[PDB]
Amino acid sequence: NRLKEKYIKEVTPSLVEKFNYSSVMQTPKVDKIVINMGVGDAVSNAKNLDKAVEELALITGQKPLITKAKKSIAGFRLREGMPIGAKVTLRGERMYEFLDKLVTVSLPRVRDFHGVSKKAFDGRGNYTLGIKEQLIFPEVDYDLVDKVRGMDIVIVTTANTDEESRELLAQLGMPF
Amino acid sequence: RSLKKGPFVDDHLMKKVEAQQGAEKKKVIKTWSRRSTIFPSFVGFTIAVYDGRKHVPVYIQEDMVGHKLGEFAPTRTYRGH
Amino acid sequence: RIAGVDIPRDKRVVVSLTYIYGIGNTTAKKVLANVGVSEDVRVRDLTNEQTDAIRAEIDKLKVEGDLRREVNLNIKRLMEIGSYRGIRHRRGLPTRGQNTKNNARTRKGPTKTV
Amino acid sequence: MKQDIHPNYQPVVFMDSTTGFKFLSGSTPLLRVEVTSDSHPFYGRVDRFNKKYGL
RNA sequence: GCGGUCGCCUCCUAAAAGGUAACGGAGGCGCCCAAAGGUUCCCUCAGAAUGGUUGGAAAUCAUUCGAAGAGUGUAAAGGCA
RNA sequence: UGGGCUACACACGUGCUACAAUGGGAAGUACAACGAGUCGCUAGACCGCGAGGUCAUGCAAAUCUCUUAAAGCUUCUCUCAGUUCGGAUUGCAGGCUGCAACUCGCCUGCAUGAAGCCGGAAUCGCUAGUAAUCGCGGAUCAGCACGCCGCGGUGAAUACGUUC
RNA sequence: CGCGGGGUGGAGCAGUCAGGUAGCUCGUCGGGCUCAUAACCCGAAGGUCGUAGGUUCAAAUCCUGCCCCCGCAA
Numbered sequence: 001n002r003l004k005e006k007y008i009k010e011v012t013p014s015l016v017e018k019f020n021y022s023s024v025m026q027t028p029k030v031d032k033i034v035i036n037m038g039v040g041d042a043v044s045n046a047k048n049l050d051k052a053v054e055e056l057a058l059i060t061g062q063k064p065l066i067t068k069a070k071k072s073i074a075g076f077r078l079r080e081g082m083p084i085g086a087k088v089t090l091r092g093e094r095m096y097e098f099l100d101k102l103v104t105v106s107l108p109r110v111r112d113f114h115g116v117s118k119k120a121f122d123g124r125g126n127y128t129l130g131i132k133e134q135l136i137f138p139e140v141d142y143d144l145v146d147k148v149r150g151m152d153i154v155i156v157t158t159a160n161t162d163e164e165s166r167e168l169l170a171q172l173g174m175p176f
Numbered sequence: 177r178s179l180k181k182g183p184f185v186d187d188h189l190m191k192k193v194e195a196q197q198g199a200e201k202k203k204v205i206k207t208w209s210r211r212s213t214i215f216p217s218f219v220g221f222t223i224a225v226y227d228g229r230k231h232v233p234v235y236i237q238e239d240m241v242g243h244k245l246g247e248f249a250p251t252r253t254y255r256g257h
Numbered sequence: 258r259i260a261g262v263d264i265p266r267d268k269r270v271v272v273s274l275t276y277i278y279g280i281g282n283t284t285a286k287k288v289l290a291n292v293g294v295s296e297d298v299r300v301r302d303l304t305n306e307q308t309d310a311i312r313a314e315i316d317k318l319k320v321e322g323d324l325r326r327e328v329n330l331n332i333k334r335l336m337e338i339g340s341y342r343g344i345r346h347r348r349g350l351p352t353r354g355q356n357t358k359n360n361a362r363t364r365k366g367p368t369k370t371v
Numbered sequence: 372m373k374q375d376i377h378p379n380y381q382p383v384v385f386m387d388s389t390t391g392f393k394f395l396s397g398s399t400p401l402l403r404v405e406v407t408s409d410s411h412p413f414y415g416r417v418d419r420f421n422k423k424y425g426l
Numbered sequence: 427g428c429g430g431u432c433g434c435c436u437c438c439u440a441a442a443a444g445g446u447a448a449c450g451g452a453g454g455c456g457c458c459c460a461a462a463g464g465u466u467c468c469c470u471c472a473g474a475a476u477g478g479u480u481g482g483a484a485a486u487c488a489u490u491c492g493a494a495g496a497g498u499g500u501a502a503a504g505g506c507a
Numbered sequence: 508u509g510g511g512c513u514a515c516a517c518a519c520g521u522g523c524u525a526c527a528a529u530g531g532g533a534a535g536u537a538c539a540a541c542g543a544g545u546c547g548c549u550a551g552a553c554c555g556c557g558a559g560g561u562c563a564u565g566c567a568a569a570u571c572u573c574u575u576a577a578a579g580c581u582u583c584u585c586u587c588a589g590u591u592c593g594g595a596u597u598g599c600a601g602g603c604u605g606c607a608a609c610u611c612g613c614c615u616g617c618a619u620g621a622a623g624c625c626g627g628a629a630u631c632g633c634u635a636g637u638a639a640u641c642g643c644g645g646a647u648c649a650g651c652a653c654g655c656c657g658c659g660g661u662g663a664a665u666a667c668g669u670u671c
Numbered sequence: 672c673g674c675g676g677g678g679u680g681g682a683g684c685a686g687u688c689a690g691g692u693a694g695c696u697c698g699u700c701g702g703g704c705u706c707a708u709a710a711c712c713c714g715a716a717g718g719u720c721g722u723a724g725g726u727u728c729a730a731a732u733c734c735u736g737c738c739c740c741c742g743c744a745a
């Protein structure tokens with residue numbers, strides 16, 4: 001909850017003094033953080049998909065939702081209704097804890113982390129990160145990391161804009 | 177030289193390069209010396225080395241210093257069968 | 258275990274450390290001598306302090322990942338500048354001035370009788 | 372939060388002994404951590420030729 | 427005479443009720459479902475743009491655009507957000 | 508002068524290393540012969556993990572050196588494994604030669620550690636100090652041969668017999 | 672435009688009915704035997720079965736089309 005207390009005390013004055021909001025309820029606020037892991041190879045054998053479910057659980061303390069196709073694609077031998085990977089939706093104190101864990105542990109633990117892209121926005125105030133390589137904190141349990149697949153890590157906000165989101169994540173800790 | 181002594185290089189080549197002190201790239205130099213080394217002074221020139229049949233050019237950069245000139249002017253135009 | 262490899266247990270210390278990508282018999286004996294233990298014990302009979310000292314000196318030394326990165330960056334350098342010695346790699350040929358006529362199967366790979 | 376499906380998610384401490392930084396957060400009490408924001412920095416052949424042969 | 431057709435369903439022909447023929451034009455059926463029924467409760471699609479790892483033109487994730495451009499077991503018509 | 512005879516989809520011959528425990532590795536220790544040597548063989552000492560380098564002595568030689576040969580023997584360890592086998596290939600550092608070692612040299616060290624678990628059709632050598640295996644020297648040679656020539660160490664089995 | 676019969680390694684053919692995961696013979700290539708060639712011997716290469724899709728756990732095979740060949744007609 002250190003991150004939430006920061007968001008309340010340090011960020012919001014430091015944010016409003018710049019952005020000139022006539023009310024605190026214009027504040028950019030992190031509404032959720034979504035994790036996704038697409039697999040595809042699960043169509044070959046979904047035991048790796050069970051493994052991805054396992055790792056999302058180990059990472060978050062939160063069982064994931066298995067996603068499924070709304071279509072069939074002969075190019076990948078893909079059938080509608082079959083499990084393409086998994087996702088998670090963190091909200092609240094768990095979400096803040098996860099983000100703080102990222103910034104304070106597992107962004108440095110990438111082999112060559114000198115920063116991240118600044119342009120990775122949607123043009124509407126929501127950020128999209130991607131782990132190319134797993135095994136970024138100790139409780140990833142390296143003894144059983146069969147494969148590195150990666151993650152999409154969406155960070156949704158009430159931010160109107162790229163600028164609001166960027167400054168928010170700056171004060172929160174994201175090393176752009 | 178693999179003996180911890182003078183890194184080998186030809187006197188005339190050294191002479192002409194050191195005369196080329198302003199480091200203009202238009203001052204392109206030729207040689208039949210495939211056996212000489214490369215130095216930091218060479219880094220940035222377009223030298224033309226005799227490969228047995230032609231003066232093949234090559235532009236030097238930082239990643240050539242410990243190497244010879246003949247390594248960048250091969251002599252065998254193999255193209256498969 | 259040590260640097261990302263679950264080494265054997267019935268083996269002795271030196272010969273089990275040989276299974277690290279970067280440590281042979283000589284450097285293994287040097288490391289065990291710098292640490293000051295017996296070279297003829299089996300790793301399933303170690304004190305974890307000895308294991309930790311071993312891990313410390315190994316991390317001081319250049320090993321699996323750094324070693325791969327170093328050798329591969331060397332190869333990529335000499336390939337990208339365009340030297341003969343890198344054209345050999347890019348073409349799949351031997352590199353130390355060998356004869357590529359009646360031999361060189363360890364780079365050619367499988368034979369193709371044509 | 373439903374029962375019998377989620378992992379045990381307990382408050383644990385993360386410690387960077389490189390700087391002694393101490394942080395609390397929930398995961399699956401004290402744990403070992405090597406590097407972090409408070410200990411990470413971002414938060415040659417000519418030279419080598421010269422070293423080998425002095426110039 | 428051969429070919430084709432003979433029973434049933436849908437459209438056009440069919441002339442703004444219905445009906446309406448031709449060896450006129452186009453297609454389907456001779457089943458499936460034990461949930462693809464019933465009821466109660468809840469939800470709304472397709473595609474495009476943007477960004478993101480393997481992951482591409484395109485799988486999956488997120489926001490916006492999005493009035494139906496989807497889906498409706500199975501033909502076409504009608505209809506249904 | 509530089510390049511090429513050293514290429515490389517491939518095929519063949521002659522060799523070397525192997526695919527292991529009759530063995531690998533560490534230590535100690537024993538027994539040869541032929542032959543070569545002046546700007547050459549080089550003792551001994553020191554440095555260096557090593558290849559080798561500095562000093563310096565003897566020898567134009569049965570007087571000195573190359574030269575304490577290796578297999579072998581006695582111990583220790585490895586205990587069946589693509590292994591501590593195998594050593595290729597490759598990266599890095601060095602050493603020598605020599606104006607110059609990239610094409611295109613030899614050696615060493617470190618690291619990797621491929622193929623290969625005795626080999627199809629077929630085919631080669633050998634009857635005794637032979638085969639088999641073990642090393643040593645020399646000619647060419649500034650430097651470089653798994654080849655060539657010679658040297659000696661250890662040391663078998665078989666030959667019924669001419670059907671083919 | 673239609674009706675029959677065909678599209679399986681280089682040639683010829685089965686396997687199609689009855690789905691069970693591509694084969695027979697010859698030929699080509701390489702190495703052996705031979706003074707040499709043929710024969711003979713030991714090896715290999717060459718096709719998801721004309722093609723785009725469906726059905727199926729699985730298709731050369733069953734279904735739907737599309738593209739070529741031989742007969743008739745045309």
Ligand SMILES: [K+]
Pocket residue numbers: 648
């Ligand atoms: K010699």
Ligand SMILES: [Mg+2]
Pocket residue numbers: 354355356
């Ligand atoms: Mg050679």
Ligand SMILES: [Mg+2]
Pocket residue numbers: none
């Ligand atoms: Mg009517």
Ligand SMILES: [Mg+2]
Pocket residue numbers: 512
């Ligand atoms: Mg020749």
Ligand SMILES: [Mg+2]
Pocket residue numbers: none
């Ligand atoms: Mg060995």
Ligand SMILES: [Mg+2]
Pocket residue numbers: none
């Ligand atoms: Mg005889």
Ligand SMILES: [Mg+2]
Pocket residue numbers: none
């Ligand atoms: Mg033949």
